[PDB]
Design a protein that fits this description.
The PDB classes it as isomerase. The entry lists the keywords 3D domain swapping, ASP F 11, allergen. Two copies of one chain form a homodimer. The first copy, chain A, is of the alpha+beta class and about 140 residues long. The first copy, chain A, has three helices and eight strands. In chain A, the strands form three sheets. Chain A has a four-stranded antiparallel beta sheet with strand order 7-2-1-8. In chain A, strand 5 and strand 6 (about 85-90) form a beta hairpin. The radius of gyration of chain A is 16 Å and the shape is globular. The first copy, chain A, has a single domain, classed as Cyclophilin (Beta Barrel). At the A-B interface, strand 2, helix 1, strand 4, strand 5 and strand 6 of A face strand 2, helix 1, strand 4, strand 5 and strand 6 of B. Strand 4 (about 65-70) of chain A pairs antiparallel with strand 6 of chain B.
Chain lengths: ~140, ~140
């Protein structure tokens, strides 16, 4: 309940052939959403093939999102939204106000890694890299 | 049922000369009448009270323009997301009320997006400005 969780992610940054392993550390909100944070921690610890270790990032959009742990043409043409207005030209329909927020990237180095990984995506969320980013380790710090 | 437009003044990335590009939108007035009405009203108000003379404050290349602290949020829809932009939309509401109407308009949007940065900070010392707005 008090520990941070981390992902070690293997990926080849944009413009290079060589893979690296970058760490993303997260602060979880176990007090706010105990069952959701608990499930994540449990999935982090399970053996490769049953949890997050050895899973990959399926959809990635630069400067926006990474999706792991598992219309578009219209969104890409330009959507106007009110929240202040926004014009978006990347896939946004997956952002439906129904998510359960359960943590946050903890530090600047981790945030840099997230940005680096996000650069491997595209407006549709399709991963451009040949090397699909893979979680090679996960655990608690 | 009319389309609405913005004429936006900006200098394309890497150039000093400003141009005016038009972005035309189709609004979904039947889906969300009150939201579309508010936008149309603000389009028609005088500068200082409406969109005319307002600027685009945050812009991300190939992704977003926003008008009218870095954080990476972790959320669940075992599927999880790490989101670093428009994070309020994860568990907060946003109302889709329109679309960019045509290819020329889309090209203008793309040009304007190019003036942003990864953080959303506008690179240019002069923000893109809505010089005219109205209905077609």
């Amino acid at each position: 309940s008090m520990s941070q969780v981390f992902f070690d992610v293997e990926y080849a940054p944009v413009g290079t052939a060589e893979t690296k392993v970058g760490r993303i550390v997260f602060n979880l909100f176990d007090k706010d959403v105990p069952k959701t944070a608990k499930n994540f921690r449990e999935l982090c610890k399970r053996p490769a093939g049953e949890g997050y270790r050895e899973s990959t990032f399926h959809r990635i959009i630069p400067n926006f999102m990474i999706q792991g742990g598992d219309s578009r043409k219209h969104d890409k043409k330009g959507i106007l939204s009110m929240a202040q207005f926004f014009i978006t030209t990347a896939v946004t329909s997956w952002l439906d106000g129904k998510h359960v927020v359960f943590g946050e990237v903890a530090d600047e180095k981790s945030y840099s890694v997230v940005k680096e990984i996000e650069a491997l995506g595209s407006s549709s969320g399709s991963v451009r890299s040949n090397t699909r980013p893979k979680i090679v380790n996960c655990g608690e710090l």
